[PDB]
């Protein structure tokens, strides 16, 4: 034993226990999801209201990379911010050299390689976040999810955090009942519902809903936050479904 004391050490199983412990920090965090729609993607997140003293709509969790990519994450919030700062540097250097904005699959690998690099040495700690991200590029819409190990895949729907099982079950229903696809405005409504349904796992404290989206028709392929009437419409739809 002692294989779990140092990062980048293979156990006799062939496992990196330090990365598996980083996943526990992710599982401890709040719920966040992603939904791939007809011509774009929708991101949503659960924000726990620890106190009445928290200013509403100020502590923004979802982050934009470039102008066309949205990023959300669950776990250690600072680790997520660090990862997004790198993502922005990667996106900036890509555009600087190649002119075109970074494609989503290209961007996904840039993060993937960086996260994976933090599993190669004992002088660094693995990332304590699972990151859901995506957007619209020349080849259409893309949704990705990235784990502490550096592992990532493309997704139709994605979920992570303490209420991931509940969320995943709801996402699976949408995939089955909508093979032809889901619209952007529908995906926003469904996203609100899923966060509300996933809140049963964090039911002690009340929460604040935060949604963003990229859509070719609705946002011209740019990342925007869901605000005002459209946000309230989604909250009303979500509240109606739980009752």
């Amino acid at each position: 034993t002692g294989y779990d004391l140092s990062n980048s050490v293979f156990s006799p199983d062939g496992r990196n226990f330090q990365v598996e412990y980083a996943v526990k920090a992710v599982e401890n965090g709040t719920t966040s999801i992603g939904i791939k729609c007809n011509d774009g993607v929708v991101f949503a997140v659960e924000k726990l209201i620890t106190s009445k003293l928290l200013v509403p709509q100020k502590n923004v969790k979802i982050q934009v990379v470039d102008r066309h990519i949205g990023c959300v994450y669950s776990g250690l919030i600072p680790d997520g911010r660090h990862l997004v700062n790198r993502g922005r540097e990667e996106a900036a250097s890509f555009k600087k050299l190649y002119k075109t904005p970074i494609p989503i699959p290209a961007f996904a690998d840039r993060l993937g390689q960086y996260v994976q690099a933090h599993t190669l040495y004992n002088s660094v700690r693995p990332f304590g976040v699972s990151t859901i991200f995506g957007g619209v590029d020349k080849n259409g819409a893309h949704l990705y999810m990235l784990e502490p190990s550096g592992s990532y895949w493309g997704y139709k729907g994605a979920a992570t955090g303490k209420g991931r099982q509940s969320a995943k079950a709801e996402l699976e229903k949408l995939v089955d009942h909508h093979p032809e696809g889901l619209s952007a405005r529908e995906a926003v409504k469904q996203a609100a519902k899923i966060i509300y349904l996933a809140h049963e796992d964090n039911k002690e404290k009340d929460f604040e809903l935060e949604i963003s989206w990229c859509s070719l028709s609705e946002t011209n392929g740019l990342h925007k936050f869901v605000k005002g009437d459209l946000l309230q419409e989604a909250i009303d739809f979500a509240q109606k479904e739980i009752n």
Binding site: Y21, K24, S51, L53, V55, N59, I77, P78, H118, V124
Partner: protein, 231 residues
């Protein structure tokens, strides 16, 4: 236990003990309170002394004409972080002729503290900060934890016995937020809030430390007979 030797090591339950131990240093520190309205933002700090011959350790540091913070924990770490803020506030002014947004100041502190929690050799910061400021979007109050977490709040408190002051502000939320265009009444609410965290000792003239910033009010610190008005 076996996973608290350095900052680069997760525990089996996904915890970072060195960060948690750094968080513990804040709880040992003296109490400080932060609260704001729409027009002004106020810091109130209980200063601590070594003995009767000693001075009372300063808790509040100015970062710019429109921004500053109060500390709780390792004072030298606050000096490092406040110096960083001073430089960032100053970079924004010299390069962009732009006063640094308080929200962006919090994002910079978060990112600086985070690098110390993921790398081998270094250590987490052992101090908590309450940043107040007035920028283009009005008054602001931030709470900084050395884990990296930064939170924008209407009011809060950190340090020893800080739960008492935090409960008071949670009740008074609707009242003190409305105190607009009245700095003295906002400070009164802050002095009354920090009083809920006191035991045995009371607020004396060289014990209390207050700071304020607002619409037409540069960040200024009040100590000595300047705070006798509020005792």
């Amino acid at each position: 236990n076996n996973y608290d030797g350095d900052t680069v090591t997760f525990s089996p339950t996904g915890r970072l003990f060195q960060v948690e131990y750094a968080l513990e240093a804040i709880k040992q520190g003296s109490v400080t309170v932060g609260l704001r309205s729409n027009t002004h933002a106020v810091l109130v700090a209980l200063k601590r002394n070594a003995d009767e011959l000693s001075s009372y350790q300063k808790k509040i540091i100015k970062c710019d004409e429109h921004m500053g913070l109060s500390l709780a924990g390792l004072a030298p770490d606050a000096r490092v972080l406040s110096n960083y803020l001073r430089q960032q506030c100053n970079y924004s002014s010299l390069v962009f002729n732009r006063k640094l947004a308080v929200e962006r100041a919090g994002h910079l502190l978060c990112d600086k503290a985070q690098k110390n929690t993921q790398s081998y050799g270094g250590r987490p910061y052992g101090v908590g900060l309450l940043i107040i400021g007035y920028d283009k979007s009005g008054a602001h109050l931030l709470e900084f934890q050395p884990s990296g977490n930064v939170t924008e709040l209407y009011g809060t408190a950190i340090g020893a016995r800080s739960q008492g002051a935090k409960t008071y502000l949670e009740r008074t939320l609707d009242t003190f937020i409305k105190i607009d265009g009245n700095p003295d009444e906002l400070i009164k609410a802050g002095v009354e809030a920090i009083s809920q965290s006191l035991r045995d000792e009371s607020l004396t003239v060289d014990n209390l430390s207050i700071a304020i910033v607002g619409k037409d009010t540069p960040f200024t610190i009040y100590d000595g007979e300047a705070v006798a008005k509020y005792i």
